[PDB]
Amino acid sequence: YEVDEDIFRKKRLTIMDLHPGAGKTKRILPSIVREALKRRLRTLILAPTRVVAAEMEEALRGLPIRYQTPAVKSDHTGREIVDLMCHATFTTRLLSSTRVPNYNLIVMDEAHFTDPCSVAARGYISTRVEMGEAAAIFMTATPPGSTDPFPQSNSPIEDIEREIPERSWNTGFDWITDYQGKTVWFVPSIKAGNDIANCLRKSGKRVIQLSRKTFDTEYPKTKLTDWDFVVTTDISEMGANFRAGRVIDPRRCLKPVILTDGPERVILAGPIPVTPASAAQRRGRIGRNPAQEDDQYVFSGDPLKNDEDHAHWTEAKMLLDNIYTPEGIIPTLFGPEREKTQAIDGEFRLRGEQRKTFVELMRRGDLPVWLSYKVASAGISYKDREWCFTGERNNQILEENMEVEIWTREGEKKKLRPKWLDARVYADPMALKDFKEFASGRK
């Protein structure tokens, strides 16, 4: 692969939108890094997930790569070194340090990731590019704005449109279990995944479940051959490689929405249709192997473009408005994503301890951006957990249709009733478990 010379020039942002599997991560990336080093550029590589980052550092092992952990706010050497980190790690460091290096070449892989930390990162990056302080490459077949759900592939894909179960089934879906080979099944939620996986397991199928929280331990198991089904949330759209012959995709997802009628709260709306980019990335899990031309994409429904009510857009602004810049400037969203919110640049900016608490609630507290923002801008200290118990009766959190009760750090049994309700902290057993740990003052 021959690298273009102009992509290393400051004020240039290159959208590397080669089709899924074309060789963006595996082939051109090491070529770009080596060429960046030759030019003595201060280089940053951004991976969507910890797993993908680990694959990058394994592949770039011969080069002066340094993986950067979010447990560390900055890490500067007096040496020629390429920094490697997750999208979210970059955004956290921007919020928590003034010692963020002045990278003049930034590569964001799987730059289609729509999680707020990634949207915020693209905002900061593009701002630096447009200010003439950096060159950046966004690697993704589906850049922000894409609407082709059936892009080019390395090998032919059989696109099959048919009814897909939303829940456990007894009969009428023989084609699912009769299939000889491996399947990746995209589900709209973890608990939808729990039910589907349970159904497949009672049929004697070996299934691995994937979600954001379990991705690190569960994904490596898919690299072995002792499995029939992967049941996964949208997280697998971000550079997850499966050696499988089929994707099952009912093209559905949950969408966080900030509601403003009465007390502000985040709900999880849907299931709703995925975006055409998401559908393409799910489909793009297969058709990757030149030697295997039998791959199937089994789908249901049309994708939906309009996602302007997605909470991730205002959450991205809450992050961006609090990002430290050398000049003191407020960075704006990436061009094509500016339309997604009506927020006035800088309206979410916090000062002093409130800004510090905002960051702490996200990184140490594991809370969503919106929820962290509401607590921090209320003037509440990080260790002060009273808000988890002082909400209105409607804010009572249920588990198995019964009221959740928590032992506090002071040793009192209080009903879990937060002042601010964000559906994501009680969306599934694991999220609730983590949030109970927060409410009981255990982190």
Ligand X SMILES: Nc1ncnc2c1ncn2[C@@H]1O[C@H](COP(=O)(O)OP(=O)(O)O)[C@@H](O)[C@H]1O
Question: 311 with 257: CB under 8 angstroms?
Answer: yes
**Residue among 95, 121, 94 at smallest CA distance from 109:** 121
Least distance CB 30 / Mn ion (angstroms): 13
> Rounded to the nearest whole angstrom, what is the least distance from the CB of residue 205 to Cl ion in the complex?
21
Annotated ligand binding at 411? The verdict is no
Q: Residue 289's binding partner, choosing from Cl ion, ligand X, Mn ion, none, with beta-carbon cut-off 5 to 8 A by kind?
A: ligand X
Binding mask 9-48 for Cl ion (x = CB under 5 A): ----------------------------------------
Stretch of residues binding Mn ion (CB under 5 A), selected from 186-194, 232-240, 365-373, 390-398:
232-240
Chosen residue from 8, 21, 24, 127 binding Mn ion by CB under 5 A: 24
314 binds, among Cl ion, Mn ion, ligand X, none (CB under 5 to 8 A by kind): none
CA 105, CA 134: separation in Å to the nearest integer? 6
Compute the distance between CA of residue 168 and CA of residue 163 in angstroms, rounded to an integer.
13
Task: List contacts with ligand X (CB under 6 A).
Answer: 18, 20-27, 154, 241, 288-289
Is 142 a binder of Mn ion (CB under 5 A)? no
Q: What is the DSSP string of 269-330?
A: EEEEEPPHHHHHHHHTTSS--TT----EEEE-S------TT-HHHHHHHHHHTT---TT---
Is residue 118 a contact residue for Cl ion (CB under 5 A)? Answer: no
Residue 232 interacting with Cl ion (CB under 5 A): no
Residue 20 marked in a binding site = yes
3-class SS at 13? strand
Which lies closer to Mn ion via its Cβ, residue 55 or residue 195? 55
26 interface partner picked from Cl ion, ligand X, Mn ion, none, CB below 5 to 8 A per type: ligand X
Least CB distance from residue 25 to Mn ion, whole Å? 3
Q: Give the distance, in angstroms, between the CA of residue 408 and the centroid of all CA atoms in the same chain.
A: 31
Q: Which of 181, 184, 299 is nearest to 251 (CA)?
A: 299
Report the alpha-carbon angle 332-140-70, nearest 5: 65
CB 237 within 8 Å of CB 251: no
Hey, what amino acid is at 309? D
212 binds Cl ion (CB under 5 A): yes
| 44 Cβ contact partners less than 8 Å away, ≥ 6 residues apart | 82, 83, 84, 85, 90, 101, 103, 105, 106, 107
Q: Residue 231: which H helix or E strand, with range?
A: strand 229-232
Single out the segment in contact with Mn ion by CB under 5 A; choices: 23-31, 51-59, 196-204, 289-297.
23-31
CB closer to ligand X, 154 vs 189: 154
How far is it, in rounded angstroms, from Cα 245 to Cα 442? 44
233 is in an annotated binding site: no
**405 in helix, strand or coil?**
strand
Of residues 244 and 431, the one with the C-beta less far from Cl ion? 431
Chosen residue from 211, 232, 275, 278 binding Cl ion by CB under 5 A: 211
What residue ranges bind Mn ion (CB under 5 A)? Answer: 24-25, 239
What residue ranges bind Cl ion (CB under 5 A)? Answer: 211-212, 233, 235
Residues annotated in a binding site: 18-25
